[PDB]
Amino acid sequence: SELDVNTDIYSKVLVTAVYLALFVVGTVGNTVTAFTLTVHYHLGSLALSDLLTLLLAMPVELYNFIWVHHPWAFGDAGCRGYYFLRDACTYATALNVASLSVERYLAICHPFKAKTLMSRSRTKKFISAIWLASALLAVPMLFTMGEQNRSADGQHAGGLVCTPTIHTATVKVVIQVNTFMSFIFPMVVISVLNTIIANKLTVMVRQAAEPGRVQALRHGVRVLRAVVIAFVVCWLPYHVRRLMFCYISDEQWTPFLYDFYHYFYMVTNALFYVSSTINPILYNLVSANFRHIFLAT
């Protein structure tokens, strides 16, 4: 009965270095982005969501999930609240990216309609609903579990292990619903809206044939595609590991698969945080007008 992780020290150091290197960027640049800034409200909201995703979530992992697996510090309520915060931040980030996509699509394709459907007060209402209100509604059923002591150490802190206590059927169902709400829905909306906007921009490029405008629209469409590419490459590993935790036809794991799964957890959460670090880089690259102010501040 494995009481403590079998992960290598080399990984324990390399992954930790990666985590801190992503943390520095996703804190400094994200806070600067929030300071610099009706789409700007959405851009700042997504920046705040990513900053929370990083700051609130990452530090708890170290020494409890990354550097160690046996002991768990926070109590049952503590672990439940930590998972609540993690899932709320994840859902908020995904839904806010989708909201940014739809807002920009409405603003570009039909600006006159946007003038009404995207009023300043209406935009404030939508952003408030999506961020700090929508996330808290979908998480309660998705992260309010933990503190299931299974390690044989028992009383020893290393023996107390936090894990979702729901039954295999119920837990699997809730993870499936979580993936459906956080990945397929916002991915679908983002993909379709970005494809429509990319088609419009490509049409403009074809008709445009000025060099500055051509470069601007080409970079815009390239970044519009890179947004979904980054979304998939950074989220699909995380959701896939989360599902294959549950979507398994048997309870038998070979030890090699156990260590591989732990390494997979490390890299997948690293990618999940990388996703939150990306936003300022693309914000700077896609807009020189924003780039200069970002560098100034």
């Binding site: 998972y83 299974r150 936090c162 894990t163 935790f245 309870e251 794991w253 156990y258 732990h262 957890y265």
Partner: peptide, 6 residues
């Protein structure tokens, strides 16, 4: 050997 971390 079923894991625990999420």
């Amino acid at each position: 050997r079923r894991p625990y971390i999420l």
